[PDB]
Amino acid sequence: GKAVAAIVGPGNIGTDLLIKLQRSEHIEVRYMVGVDPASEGLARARKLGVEASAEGVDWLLEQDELPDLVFEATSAKAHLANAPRYAEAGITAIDLTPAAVGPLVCPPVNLTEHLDAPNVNMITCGGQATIPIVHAVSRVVPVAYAEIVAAIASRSAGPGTRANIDEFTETTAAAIEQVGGAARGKAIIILNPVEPPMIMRDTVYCAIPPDADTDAITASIEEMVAEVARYVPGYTLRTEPQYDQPRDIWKGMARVAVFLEVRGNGDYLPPWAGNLDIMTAAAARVGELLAQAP
Amino acid sequence: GKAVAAIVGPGNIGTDLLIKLQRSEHIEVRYMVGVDPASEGLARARKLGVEASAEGVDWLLEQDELPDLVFEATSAKAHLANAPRYAEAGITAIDLTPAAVGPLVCPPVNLTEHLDAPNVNMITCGGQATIPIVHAVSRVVPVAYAEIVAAIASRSAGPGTRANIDEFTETTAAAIEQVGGAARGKAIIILNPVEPPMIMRDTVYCAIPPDADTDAITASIEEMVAEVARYVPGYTLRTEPQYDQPRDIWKGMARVAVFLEVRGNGDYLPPWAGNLDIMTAAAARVGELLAQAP
Amino acid sequence: APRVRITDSTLRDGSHAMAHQFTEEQVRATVHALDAAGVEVIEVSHGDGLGGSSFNYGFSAVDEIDLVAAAVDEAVNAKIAVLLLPGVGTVRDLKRAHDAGASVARIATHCTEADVSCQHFAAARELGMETVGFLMLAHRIGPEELARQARIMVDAGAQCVYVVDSAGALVLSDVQARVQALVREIGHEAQVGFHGHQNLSLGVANSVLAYQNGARQIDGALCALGAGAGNSPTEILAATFERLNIETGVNVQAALAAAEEVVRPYLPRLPWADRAAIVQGYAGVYSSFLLHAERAAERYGVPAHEILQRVGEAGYVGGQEDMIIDIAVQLAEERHG
Amino acid sequence: APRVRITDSTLRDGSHAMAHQFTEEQVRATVHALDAAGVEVIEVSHGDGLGGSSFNYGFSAVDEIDLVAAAVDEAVNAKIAVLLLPGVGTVRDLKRAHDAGASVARIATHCTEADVSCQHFAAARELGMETVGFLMLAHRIGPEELARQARIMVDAGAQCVYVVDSAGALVLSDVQARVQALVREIGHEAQVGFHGHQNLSLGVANSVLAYQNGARQIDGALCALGAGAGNSPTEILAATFERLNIETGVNVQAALAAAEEVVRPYLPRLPWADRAAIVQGYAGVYSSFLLHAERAAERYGVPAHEILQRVGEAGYVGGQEDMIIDIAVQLAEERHG
């Protein structure tokens, strides 16, 4: 019954995803695929009965039984190389890197929009945490500009994240516009090595009309936070959304600032690494629907 | 014919005085008297044919032929000890220290006032340079307060000066009032070791009425400077007297500031040591008149 | 005695103190005065580097690329430098600054995160720019750990790596130890720099000590204009190195005139070690948080120095200005009781 | 690690910056805040010491002896110190300050003139006061010459002798060399101190280096209030020594509050290293000449920094404020042509 899945990239995101997908109703993770025989994710795959290989995508594509789905959590450049190979082999790809070969998917906002695509992009951790908030504002009032700041514990960002910081920026900004509904988007990512490790923070700033109904915006935000929290229970509002009066420098627009904290469930890294969960729970939602196609 | 003089204190002032007194019409310096056999002034006395001794005032008072006059240039405490010994022996004393056992004499102002006294005090270098200016102002307008600043090359201030800095202050201030005619007086002395050595500077500040005729004050100052310069040719005005408008802090009085430089003739120390000359020329003037008494 | 190269950051770090409100005329006047004084490198960007204009850090009054272009047009001998922070600025931003004529790329990471700088160093070297690496908040880790991060930057293409006292929290021997370690690690193939802040009034001394331990690049700003209590003042660095007989190429009188006659007239206020800035130095808080903390203090009715003390306790890094608002909201409730 | 004793001179050196206009209320508030912060010695006199009120230096708004008495009344734990300069203040002035309750006599001479201090040290010891000797403008002579002058003060009765950077002209190793020489000469029987000015922004570092080379007494002022660019700030000395684990007995938070909440509100302007103050540091000009130079600049229509440059060339010492007027008159004529 279950769709046969491969995970390419047995790192922080890939290993968290492996755990979450083994709770899945419709997906069997059959293959874990990396490039370093010492990768902890390959060891976790083996302990869980999943076929594991450090022989890369070459090895995956040689297998007698090809997966129905591939989730890639390597780095943007690696996905750019692998995406056409998946397309040729007829394997539907869910891209957890910011490569953005496929259209941008934020499940709380546009889950069903791109289900027919051969490759879907899940944006970034920052995006998955904040684009639902951008949408919660823009569905109430026009948002001329929206900016997100994602701060992550350094221990939770592996080499694959660190190698694609530029792409993180640009893909998240593009998604703020195309999926979040803001006319212009900006994204910032900060790595903090503090001990004890920081729980992921995300701030969302939206330019809003000076005459906006701020009670309506707050209600919309709260509703959206509850919808996200159904899938990531540690996704919370830190404070009431903060509204600020118009300024000349803001072209006469007012602002709303929304402060989120994202605790994870501790599947692989501890709960402070909610950045993993906000992405992997999103990828799992997309995967569960893709798995049910004929 | 000439009055027989002793100089007690063969230091900077004492040695400059020795030279100047050998040009004198009415005084023969017979004795140079110190306490240190290495004193340069005793060597200069011997070269000039003057009886010299390092055996002190004890030795002087043992001599078969006592002097008519004694000039003392030791230190305030030494003069305080010696003054009654001179008085007992019937020797008229001219005190170049700030001891001020006798009344205060500034020859450009009150030369003849105290000629009958057994002991006259010549104030200080600062006083002799500045009290003529205080008088030049106070003879034109009331001076509620006058302050003088005397800056001297460190090389020209011997141990005797350095030991009586407090007395320098207090005696000069007293003379600013009693001889200069100011209602209140203040005196500051500064030693500067700069190379090349500094020519003595003296600044005089007088509180003056806000409606004073400043042209009249300046004319009086210039006249007095010319009278002093007849005896100390290097005594000069650096600038026009500087007048400043009344201030609240000055109790509504205005100010005149007078900037003097005092070059010496280089008799003992070089001309930068005009502080020696301004005192010794003053003492010589008093001595010449005391010498002519019956 | 080997010469030291001063980079002036009046127009980049100073942008923090100006709330990024620099005009083209101010940039042109300041570049002209710096260049005429002999200053060899003049940094021009938003306070938080290229792409810094944002709600989080404050918007620029004038596009920083236009200011970079005006700086390049104005300079006769000086190189124009730009700062970028990976995670804020992008390679695309760097390319825009290069097109505008910038010739020195200064790439800044938190001191423990040098490996995020690889994309930007590669792009800068391909463009033929001089490269400088900035290890921010350098008091947060020890000398040898910092040298390991310096090596990562050199391997990536940095031609100099700075010890950056972003919080103005380093004290004398602290700088000596870090500069010594970087010199041991990278000195045979790259220069070492120092960038000091004035939060404990040690920027200039720390800069002298940096040079005496092998640093050949030192940052200042005219009138200390910069984040927190300000940067080591360019005009004082010029005077002090001259007294020490260390060649900088900077005319002291001309630098004093630049500070006094060009920069001082446009200062919003004098850079000052008041209680809030000293709390930054003591607690190790990123200097650019200061004006944001003062804004939040007024917005929420709480003291700025109490915001900054809390920020100190939390260990935030450069770029985390948003956390100031969360803390100020909390403090307003706690103080109410 | 041995403790250091900070003497605060907000109310003496700071008197220069206030043009000697301190009120009794300001003194009482400042003494209270210093004393409560743990500051052990608080200096209270006219800028130029007892008897300083004059045309030459400026008149006090309130008799300094009344201010000393108010300081003594206000202090619970702190000693009240007075400064005297032989040639300006007298033994009679010292006796008045002793009667008012001052318990520390700080006797200051130009660095080459210690032997004028004998009368004042004798009188202070007879009164049972603690004695401190100040060797002013200590950059003007070398370490060994300065140590010889220190010996003269110790022989006269000084229990501590300071290296006093009156011009803010000493640079780091300069302080190390001088403190080392005094420690060698007098250390077995007297303490060594350091008093720094901020004209090159090196006061605090110089103070740390002084302590590390054996100085056990260090001066500061709240908000740097003092002559020229100001003194080493008491609140920064407290923070920095605390970071270095050197006991001062001063509560950092309380010192930051004294500076911010008590002193800063009455500042005429912030102590600042502008061009005029930096010219003092560079050229070695006595710091208290600054406001007098600015007054003459306005009076005669010439630049203050040009007056100070000339003063630098002439080599004047502390107390020679009158020379500023002569120079300003000359400059007005030269500039006219």
Ligand SMILES: NC(=O)c1ccc[n+]([C@@H]2O[C@H](COP(=O)([O-])OP(=O)(O)OC[C@H]3O[C@@H](n4cnc5c(N)ncnc54)[C@H](O)[C@@H]3O)[C@@H](O)[C@H]2O)c1
């Ligand atoms: N860390 C986060 O919170 C986070 C959140 C969302 C998205 N992401 C994105 O997920 C991706 C991985 O991030 P990460 O932090 O888990 O990195 P990581 O370095 O921990 O994991 C990357 C894994 O991919 C393997 N790998 C690299 N190249 C490969 C190739 N060509 N084929 C197969 N395997 C390969 C690596 O050996 C490693 O196991 C990045 O694109 C990152 O931007 C990260």
Ligand SMILES: NC(=O)c1ccc[n+]([C@@H]2O[C@H](COP(=O)([O-])OP(=O)(O)OC[C@H]3O[C@@H](n4cnc5c(N)ncnc54)[C@H](O)[C@@H]3O)[C@@H](O)[C@H]2O)c1
């Ligand atoms: N230096 C000046 O410009 C200046 C000007 C005017 C007045 N004075 C006053 O003149 C006096 C001497 O000053 P100076 O600079 O020439 O000092 P000095 O030290 O050069 O001369 C003092 C001389 O007196 C000798 N002496 C000391 N005690 C003595 C004693 N009991 N009996 C005999 N001789 C003794 C010393 O050995 C020395 O030769 C001081 O009182 C000083 O204040 C000095």
Ligand SMILES: [Cl-]
């Ligand atoms: Cl919020």
Ligand SMILES: [Cl-]
């Ligand atoms: Cl005059």
Ligand SMILES: [Cl-]
């Ligand atoms: Cl140290």
Ligand SMILES: [Cl-]
């Ligand atoms: Cl040095």
Ligand SMILES: [Mg+2]
């Ligand atoms: Mg900085």
Ligand SMILES: [Mg+2]
């Ligand atoms: Mg001082």
